[PDB]
Amino acid sequence: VQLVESGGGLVQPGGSRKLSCSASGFAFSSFGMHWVRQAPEKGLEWVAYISSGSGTIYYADTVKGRFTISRDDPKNTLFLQMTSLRSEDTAMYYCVRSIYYYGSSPFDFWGQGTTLTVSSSDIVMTQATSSVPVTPGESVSISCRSSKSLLHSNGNTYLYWFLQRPGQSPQLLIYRMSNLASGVPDRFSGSGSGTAFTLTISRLEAEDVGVYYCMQHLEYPLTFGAGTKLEL
Amino acid sequence: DQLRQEAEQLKNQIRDARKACADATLSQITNNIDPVGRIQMRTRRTLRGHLAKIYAMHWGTDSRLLVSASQDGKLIIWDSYTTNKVHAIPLRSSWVMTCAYAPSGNYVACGGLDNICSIYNLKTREGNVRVSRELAGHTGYLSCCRFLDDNQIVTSSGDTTCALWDIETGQQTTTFTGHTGDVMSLSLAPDTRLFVSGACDASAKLWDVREGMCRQTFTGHESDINAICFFPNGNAFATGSDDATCRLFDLRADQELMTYSHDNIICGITSVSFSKSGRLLLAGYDDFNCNVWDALKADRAGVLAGHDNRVSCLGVTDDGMAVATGSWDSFLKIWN
Amino acid sequence: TLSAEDKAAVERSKMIDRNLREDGEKAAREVKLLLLGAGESGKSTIVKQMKGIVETHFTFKDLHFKMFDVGGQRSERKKWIHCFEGVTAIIFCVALSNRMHESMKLFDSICNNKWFTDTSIILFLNKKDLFEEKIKKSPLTICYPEYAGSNTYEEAAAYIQCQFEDLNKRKDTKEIYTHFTCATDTKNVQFVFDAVTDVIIKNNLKDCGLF
Amino acid sequence: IAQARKLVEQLKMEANIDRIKVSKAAADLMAYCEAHAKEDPLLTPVPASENPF
Amino acid sequence: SWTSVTYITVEILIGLCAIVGNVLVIWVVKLNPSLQTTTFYFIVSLALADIAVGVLVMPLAIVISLGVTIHFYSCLFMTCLMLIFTHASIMSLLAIAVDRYLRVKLTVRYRRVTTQRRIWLALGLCWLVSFLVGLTPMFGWNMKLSSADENLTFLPCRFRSVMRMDYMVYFSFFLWILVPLVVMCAIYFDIFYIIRNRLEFKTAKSLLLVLFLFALCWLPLSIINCILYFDGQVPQTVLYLGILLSHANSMMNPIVYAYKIKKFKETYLLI
Ligand SMILES: CC(C)=CCNc1ncnc2c1ncn2[C@@H]1O[C@H](CO)[C@@H](O)[C@H]1O
């Protein structure tokens, strides 16, 4: 599985850039494709979403109606074409794949990402802090609060925990509330109920550092948390 | 002759020992036990998508998912709570009469007449389903494949022999010979260490998957055995023949407890299962219907009346919450 | 009241159901010709000369055939034949050269089955270069004394064919087809094409009630 | 000499059986069903609220 | 006169029989999930055409006889409803006749061309034209386009008082009753000609039982309306004769089309 984008660079306001997500290593024609941006040293922010087969499309209300999503299944290439760019589109654009069936992890693999630079109701997710110093071997608990109760009538509690190690793209940890990711150490664990959600990390190691986040499904647009950063 | 006389007298006098120590029929004791009445059961869902005769159906380990094999060469994994088609598997050989669901939900192995018990992998890294290891080496049609672990599968066939296979290596670790006809059904024990198989010579023999030793042998039917399954506690198993008879054997009594045939019944059984409590002996008959037999009184305490063709497979969830039934009408129905 | 995922789940379910529908539509596009025959009956000859279970997929004149040789099955218990219901037409094979009595019994058993009761049969006896050479040794009385006609390959073969078809216990619903021409010439396939054509036409008109 | 020897040996261990009779195991089947009657969703209908269909 | 009660009495019973008979045809098809192939799509639609011809056209025919002052456009609408359902049954007869011809002439390709898409496409096209033909009188051709009584808005409506005759002859009979009869004739001719060529008289008995019985019920009234439009005159009993024969077609339709399919026969006998 290897998601690599291109088309990044510097552009003046008012122009139109286009971003490609070449995929290689999985069945692209069945995997819902998102687009996620990370504005410099602020955090993650959802952009768009295209379902399998180009059926359902959504957008973030911030840029709704100004961005367009294209999908080429027989070529395994996902495009994100932007029309007009202001001084806020500058961010780190990632390419995230998704499969939604009973029991899946639709936010497992994150692309390497492409940086973009531009010259000069909704559910709110609140992260408690932005920096937490700690040393290896100490149990750490992170938490973020919610606007609505994410517990849908199905019994699901659609919350996601990722982790962005410095210099790398995010990585999924817990994909609904306590369901570990694919190949993540069985160390990470999560719990909570209704509106208070916490991530517990016992026996901490050196490579566990980076900016944490909590993203929430259960409605579009997808709103990230501010982001806790473990320090050491 | 000397050895022939010894074998004949051995059979006769161990049968005499069985008879002399036989106390009474089970009905003699449970006669005073009250019946259950009528289990009038309703079709909740109706699973449509298969476009060929349905043959086999196995419940998930979590009592949610289903596997169904048809003559359209399509093995389809369903979700029973929303009638959603979770996966669709295109098989190579459509002559598929049996296949089941791994207890860990990782693998589904499914094959038939082509004598190969293929194994498919679901929770892959690419999101699709691929064949893990195809178990080849039989010379006749397969029937009632069953998973013991993720690397241990039991298969019967028409070669009169069941073979325990090693999925990793791909070789037949053990062979269970001793039948005088096609072995067309087997069921794994709940403890996953014993398994009973019924063959076309009107006899079923309990076999050990560990040492490949034929422990018990069972007779009492007049024609081939069509279905076989364990009582939930792994101490008894019932069989259904073309004699329109469902028979229950105890692995220790070594004798047939009760037949569950009724005079009006004209045609034979094709599949049998059990309720989680082991009180409702379900059996899919050839005419059109499934019959709900109270395993203690052998009375039809309800009839599942749909299936404008013959019923070919039954299944009861691990928790007993549902009953999925399949017929040649290419429509599975969950009844509750 | 569908969660955000469940709408995508229903979308995927609809996609899979459409794929199943089109796959089954293609499955109903192909001809199923079950092939039977006793030992050394020439089924191998049939499969080689023409264009466990063995599936032989070929096409002719824009029609696709799926003939299934159940000869591999070493168990003559007939616990699989019932899966072959709905085949367009079966192919019994036999050669003139007490094997003929076994062929008679097998043909009768195939005809009288409940599952093939409305499925026409197609009998081939193609090899003709040797069927007549060996007749000079003796008439159809080596084990069939009832024959009383002249010992010639025109009459002997016709009598054998008539005796075979006499095993047809119900012609009202079902029909029988036969072939005798030499196997060397490429006419065996055409007869398969003609018989399938006629049987499908009769199945169609049968459905309408026009029949 | 060694063709039916294993067959009769299987009969020999078929004679050495932990013989539990039809009435000795008669209550075993009754006990299992009775002690597990309440969990069975089909024998005793579960209320429609918990019925997930 | 005694004719009216006889015409009323014969009319009502015919409609009741159609309701029971066609209801049974609808009943049989659904109870057997095996009886929903392409052929049974036409038959169920045809039964739906005839059920209305027995439920609505039957009471309406009685109303037209009495002739109460119920306003023209209301009672012209009563006639326009009466044409659509009858012509719906006639059109379903043409579809089935076309359906059979495709089956024989396409040979193997029939099942590969008559997809469920096109079955509904043709089925809708036939029903749609029936409404267009029957509701045409509201779009210009009616007695007002020539009538001299301008206050002719209330009147005891007689079928002659509302619909211009030139219509029931030139348009209805000559194009949507006759041409169907002509085409169904040429169809069953070639179908029987081919089937005989391949192979039979049982096929002939069914086909001519169709063409004959169809013509027996429709032409009578049509020729009555052919002669009356050309300055002819007709006894009251004779006029009643044509009407009852047509409405008997609806209750007679089940037995000559659905009952000639064996699979239907036992299914009907089984129930
Ligand atoms: C010269 C002419 C035009 C004479 C006709 N006189 C009619 N008078 C009354 N009802 C009629 C007539 N023709 C048809 N219907 C009804 O209208 C239906 C459609 O024609 C018939 O089924 C029948 O119920």
Side-chain angles (χ1 to χ4, degrees):
Chain A
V1 285
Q2 195 193 19
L3 294 174
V4 64
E5 310 92 354
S6 61
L10 193 146
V11 72
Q12 296 296 320
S16 144
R17 298 296 299 278
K18 194 178 179 181
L19 310 185
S20 296
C21 182
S22 51
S24 296
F26 63 100
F28 182 79
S29 301
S30 67
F31 274 108
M33 281 325 268
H34 300 269
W35 272 102
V36 169
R37 81 180 168 183
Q38 172 168 1
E41 69 274 15
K42 296 183 290 294
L44 294 174
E45 190 54 17
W46 180 68
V47 172
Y49 155 60
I50 179 167
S51 181
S52 47
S54 301
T56 299
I57 298 194
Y58 289 132
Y59 287 83
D61 63 358
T62 299
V63 297
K64 174 173 320 203
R66 227 174 78 204
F67 288 173
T68 192
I69 294 284
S70 299
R71 181 177 181 170
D72 196 357
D73 291 331
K75 307 293 302 318
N76 302 327
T77 309
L78 176 85
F79 313 94
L80 173 71
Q81 161 68 253
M82 311 75 78
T83 51
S84 178
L85 284 85
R86 75 281 191 191
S87 167
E88 184 59 29
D89 288 332
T90 184
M92 187 66 204
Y93 284 139
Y94 297 98
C95 176
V96 188
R97 65 182 181 88
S98 79
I99 189 73
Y100 298 94
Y101 64 90
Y102 168 66
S104 61
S105 84
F107 264 120
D108 186 74
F109 193 65
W110 292 63
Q112 184 178 2
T114 191
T115 297
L116 183 63
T117 52
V118 180
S119 66
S120 295
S121 63
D122 306 356
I123 312 299
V124 186
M125 272 315 158
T126 72
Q127 183 62 255
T129 176
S130 179
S131 159
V132 171
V134 65
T135 52
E138 313 278 337
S139 309
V140 184
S141 179
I142 319 176
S143 296
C144 68
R145 314 201 61 270
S146 299
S147 302
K148 293 183 63 187
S149 69
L150 286 177
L151 181 163
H152 198 267
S153 180
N154 292 319
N156 299 111
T157 309
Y158 306 93
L159 175 57
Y160 289 61
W161 282 104
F162 305 89
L163 196 154
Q164 185 172 28
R165 294 164 142 99
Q168 292 69 239
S169 67
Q171 188 274 331
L172 194 151
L173 271 53
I174 301 284
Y175 63 92
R176 272 173 265 296
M177 262 297 318
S178 64
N179 290 318
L180 277 296
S182 176
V184 67
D186 57 353
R187 294 178 65 250
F188 299 93
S189 176
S191 62
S193 52
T195 55
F197 310 130
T198 176
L199 183 64
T200 184
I201 309 157
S202 310
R203 281 82 65 193
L204 189 150
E205 293 82 3
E207 293 82 3
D208 291 331
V209 306
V211 186
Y212 286 69
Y213 294 108
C214 65
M215 171 175 88
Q216 66 92 31
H217 198 253
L218 183 65
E219 61 86 20
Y220 293 73
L222 302 163
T223 57
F224 290 93
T228 284
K229 183 173 42 54
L230 287 194
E231 294 294 328
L232 156 69
Chain B
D1 53 355
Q2 182 265 319
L3 62 93
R4 288 301 194 84
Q5 201 96 39
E6 188 193 30
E8 187 72 25
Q9 68 89 34
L10 261 176
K11 297 299 293 183
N12 285 119
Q13 276 97 19
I14 296 89
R15 199 257 177 286
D16 183 34
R18 183 188 312 188
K19 174 64 72 176
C21 305
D23 297 332
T25 71
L26 193 65
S27 77
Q28 189 83 92
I29 298 90
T30 191
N31 184 30
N32 53 347
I33 305 302
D34 54 349
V36 65
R38 175 196 53 266
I39 296 90
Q40 183 293 300
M41 185 180 288
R42 282 83 60 82
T43 289
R44 313 279 184 180
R45 314 293 181 172
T46 290
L47 279 59
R48 293 182 183 174
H50 298 285
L51 301 176
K53 299 174 175 77
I54 295 148
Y55 291 110
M57 182 278 288
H58 204 254
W59 267 117
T61 197
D62 65 332
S63 160
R64 175 155 184 153
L65 294 174
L66 275 177
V67 285
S68 295
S70 51
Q71 195 50 65
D72 199 2
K74 283 321 191 313
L75 182 63
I76 302 299
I77 297 89
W78 301 47
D79 180 17
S80 169
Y81 293 106
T82 64
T83 67
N84 292 357
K85 289 180 190 63
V86 177
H87 282 293
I89 297 169
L91 298 173
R92 294 151 301 261
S93 74
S94 307
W95 310 107
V96 177
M97 301 75 87
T98 188
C99 58
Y101 182 76
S104 73
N106 297 114
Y107 306 115
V108 68
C110 184
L113 286 192
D114 62 358
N115 308 344
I116 58 184
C117 167
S118 296
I119 300 187
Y120 295 104
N121 190 21
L122 310 169
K123 314 173 101 63
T124 71
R125 195 66 187 152
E126 281 86 310
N128 54 30
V129 298
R130 280 305 301 145
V131 67
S132 69
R133 291 295 305 256
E134 52 88 30
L135 311 173
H138 293 284
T139 59
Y141 79 116
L142 306 171
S143 53
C144 290
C145 308
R146 280 297 179 260
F147 269 99
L148 278 156
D149 313 325
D150 281 329
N151 204 41
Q152 187 177 3
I153 178 170
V154 191
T155 43
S156 162
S157 177
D159 310 340
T160 76
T161 175
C162 301
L164 172 68
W165 291 83
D166 188 291
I167 306 171
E168 182 65 26
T169 62
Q171 63 84 30
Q172 167 174 176
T173 187
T174 314
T175 311
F176 320 108
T177 61
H179 268 305
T180 54
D182 295 358
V183 192
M184 71 155 278
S185 70
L186 68 86
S187 77
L188 273 177
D191 66 327
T192 69
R193 294 178 65 88
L194 295 159
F195 78 115
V196 298
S197 65
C200 281
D201 55 334
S203 65
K205 305 210 284 301
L206 164 75
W207 285 345
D208 207 301
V209 78
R210 183 68 277 176
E211 59 267 17
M213 183 278 288
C214 185
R215 181 177 181 170
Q216 205 56 231
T217 175
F218 291 102
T219 58
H221 292 267
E222 291 56 70
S223 170
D224 58 358
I225 311 308
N226 296 90
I228 194 160
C229 70
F230 280 102
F231 198 83
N233 65 6
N235 290 319
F237 75 104
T239 66
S241 284
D242 272 7
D243 189 359
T245 49
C246 276
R247 288 190 200 264
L248 187 60
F249 312 99
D250 194 289
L251 296 184
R252 301 299 83 198
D254 302 354
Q255 231 164 2
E256 181 216 350
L257 277 296
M258 271 145 298
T259 314
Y260 307 91
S261 170
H262 172 242
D263 63 358
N264 189 359
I265 312 305
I266 311 298
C267 62
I269 295 95
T270 301
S271 295
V272 181
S273 178
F274 265 99
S275 59
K276 206 218 180 182
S277 171
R279 181 84 189 192
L280 294 174
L281 178 61
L282 279 70
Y285 283 73
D286 265 331
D287 45 0
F288 296 116
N289 303 347
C290 311
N291 299 353
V292 176
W293 317 77
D294 178 76
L296 283 72
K297 274 71 161 204
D299 297 339
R300 293 181 71 186
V303 187
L304 283 71
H307 284 319
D308 315 288
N309 225 324
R310 55 182 271 157
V311 172
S312 65
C313 58
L314 297 195
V316 180
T317 70
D318 290 335
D319 46 359
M321 69 176 277
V323 176
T325 75
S327 164
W328 289 9
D329 64 349
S330 82
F331 291 123
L332 309 97
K333 286 179 184 164
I334 298 84
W335 312 65
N336 199 351
Chain C
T1 307
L2 273 285
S3 82
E5 285 92 344
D6 306 334
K7 286 161 82 212
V10 175
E11 190 277 331
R12 182 174 177 178
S13 300
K14 294 290 165 68
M15 272 296 316
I16 287 159
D17 186 74
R18 280 200 298 291
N19 281 116
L20 292 204
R21 269 205 295 275
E22 68 85 9
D23 283 332
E25 190 282 332
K26 279 187 56 46
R29 174 151 291 190
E30 306 170 337
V31 173
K32 307 164 77 173
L33 287 157
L34 171 58
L35 165 53
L36 269 74
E40 62 93 30
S41 293
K43 65 183 43 52
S44 62
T45 299
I46 301 299
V47 298
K48 68 165 63 59
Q49 65 183 357
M50 61 79 71
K51 177 59 189 58
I53 193 66
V54 186
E55 293 82 3
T56 298
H57 298 229
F58 293 101
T59 63
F60 193 51
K61 301 289 154 281
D62 291 331
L63 184 58
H64 182 74
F65 303 107
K66 287 182 25 164
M67 51 195 318
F68 321 107
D69 175 358
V70 309
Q73 267 288 128
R74 290 281 74 71
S75 60
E76 277 74 19
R77 190 65 262 174
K78 305 294 99 169
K79 299 305 298 169
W80 76 89
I81 197 73
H82 64 279
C83 72
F84 279 100
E85 190 174 295
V87 287
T88 294
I90 64 171
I91 301 167
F92 198 114
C93 204
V94 72
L96 172 143
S97 302
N98 60 88
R99 280 76 65 193
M100 72 291 291
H101 281 241
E102 270 309 290
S103 303
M104 301 215 188
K105 190 267 183 181
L106 172 73
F107 200 103
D108 203 58
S109 179
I110 297 169
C111 281
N112 262 15
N113 296 115
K114 299 183 291 295
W115 284 286
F116 285 17
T117 183
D118 291 331
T119 76
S120 72
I121 288 167
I122 317 182
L123 179 49
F124 313 141
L125 284 76
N126 306 78
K127 187 256 281 178
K128 203 185 89 177
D129 290 350
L130 189 141
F131 283 12
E132 61 86 20
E133 294 293 328
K134 75 179 289 176
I135 290 170
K136 266 75 77 172
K137 90 179 80 174
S138 60
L140 188 76
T141 56
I142 61 183
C143 65
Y144 193 82
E146 178 42 36
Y147 176 60
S150 181
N151 185 13
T152 59
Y153 73 93
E154 293 83 3
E155 293 179 353
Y159 180 51
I160 297 169
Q161 152 192 28
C162 291
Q163 260 294 358
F164 291 168
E165 312 170 20
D166 291 331
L167 294 174
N168 181 346
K169 301 301 103 183
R170 46 202 70 160
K171 187 264 182 182
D172 47 55
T173 54
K174 182 162 140 33
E175 291 56 30
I176 301 299
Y177 294 98
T178 61
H179 202 115
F180 277 169
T181 317
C182 189
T184 189
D185 201 19
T186 77
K187 272 70 171 176
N188 198 328
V189 293
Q190 272 276 19
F191 189 88
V192 189
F193 176 104
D194 291 331
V196 296
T197 312
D198 186 74
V199 64
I200 301 299
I201 277 163
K202 244 54 181 172
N203 292 119
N204 275 347
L205 277 47
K206 172 58 199 180
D207 291 331
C208 182
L210 176 52
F211 206 88
Chain D
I1 191 68
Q3 192 271 329
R5 192 264 301 161
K6 62 181 179 291
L7 279 156
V8 301
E9 194 282 329
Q10 288 175 354
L11 277 296
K12 277 170 66 178
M13 60 74 68
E14 178 48 57
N16 191 0
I17 290 291
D18 54 355
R19 286 270 163 89
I20 298 171
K21 297 290 98 174
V22 297
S23 175
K24 213 164 178 212
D28 186 88
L29 278 292
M30 159 275 284
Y32 182 82
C33 276
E34 182 266 337
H36 273 247
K38 314 322 310 163
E39 52 75 18
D40 189 358
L42 311 177
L43 183 62
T44 191
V46 58
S49 298
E50 293 82 3
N51 281 107
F53 295 114
Chain E
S1 54
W2 284 8
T3 64
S4 287
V5 161
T6 292
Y7 168 73
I8 290 165
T9 292
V10 176
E11 171 52 63
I12 181 172
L13 295 162
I14 280 162
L16 269 297
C17 298
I19 295 157
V20 167
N22 304 299
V23 162
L24 292 172
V25 162
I26 301 299
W27 183 255
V28 166
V29 164
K30 74 162 181 323
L31 278 71
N32 189 358
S34 177
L35 295 174
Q36 293 82 17
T37 69
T38 74
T39 186
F40 283 134
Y41 276 179
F42 295 97
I43 285 164
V44 65
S45 66
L46 185 147
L48 272 189
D50 280 354
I51 192 66
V53 169
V55 171
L56 284 174
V57 180
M58 182 278 288
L60 280 193
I62 306 179
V63 171
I64 294 292
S65 78
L66 308 182
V68 179
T69 52
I70 305 299
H71 183 69
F72 171 85
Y73 275 117
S74 298
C75 183
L76 186 70
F77 181 74
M78 295 298 102
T79 61
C80 279
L81 182 163
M82 281 175 28
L83 290 172
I84 50 170
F85 278 131
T86 62
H87 276 278
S89 293
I90 295 169
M91 283 289 317
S92 308
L93 292 160
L94 182 62
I96 291 157
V98 175
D99 172 75
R100 299 180 176 175
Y101 180 56
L102 277 296
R103 227 179 286 279
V104 161
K105 182 56 59 55
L106 271 287
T107 74
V108 303
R109 313 200 302 289
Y110 164 84
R111 176 65 271 182
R112 293 172 63 255
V113 163
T114 310
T115 71
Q116 273 191 16
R117 183 182 295 277
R118 307 194 219 247
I119 291 160
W120 280 310
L121 177 146
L123 203 73
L125 170 59
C126 283
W127 270 78
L128 191 85
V129 164
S130 304
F131 274 32
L132 181 149
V133 165
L135 281 293
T136 297
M138 295 296 172
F139 292 72
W141 283 0
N142 56 3
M143 295 299 291
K144 279 73 177 175
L145 192 72
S146 303
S147 297
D149 186 74
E150 273 70 32
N151 189 359
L152 184 63
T153 53
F154 286 171
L155 61 83
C157 67
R158 279 204 51 183
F159 185 70
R160 306 204 58 180
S161 290
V162 300
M163 182 95 97
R164 298 179 67 247
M165 291 307 182
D166 73 302
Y167 166 81
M168 294 299 291
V169 161
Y170 285 133
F171 196 59
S172 176
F173 169 44
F174 167 69
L175 183 63
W176 305 105
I177 294 170
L178 189 70
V179 169
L181 182 64
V182 168
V183 65
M184 301 215 268
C185 181
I187 294 298
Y188 289 173
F189 163 63
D190 207 312
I191 297 169
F192 180 62
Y193 155 68
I194 293 306
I195 191 166
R196 171 259 297 291
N197 188 3
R198 185 157 300 275
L199 275 170
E200 66 178 0
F201 289 139
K202 183 66 182 294
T203 301
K205 165 159 172 59
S206 301
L207 291 199
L208 294 187
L209 185 65
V210 175
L211 293 175
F212 171 86
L213 294 174
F214 169 76
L216 177 84
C217 284
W218 278 124
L219 294 174
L221 201 73
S222 282
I223 301 299
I224 281 174
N225 297 0
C226 175
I227 62 170
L228 279 164
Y229 163 86
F230 281 115
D231 315 298
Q233 189 42 286
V234 169
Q236 167 161 219
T237 313
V238 165
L239 184 65
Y240 295 156
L241 187 152
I243 295 170
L244 294 165
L245 281 193
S246 308
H247 302 216
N249 178 313
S250 66
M251 60 79 74
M252 169 273 290
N253 225 353
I255 301 299
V256 171
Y257 263 118
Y259 214 80
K260 309 294 286 299
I261 297 169
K262 276 72 70 177
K263 300 149 289 301
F264 182 76
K265 287 177 48 55
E266 69 275 16
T267 308
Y268 182 76
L269 291 173
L270 294 174
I271 180 64

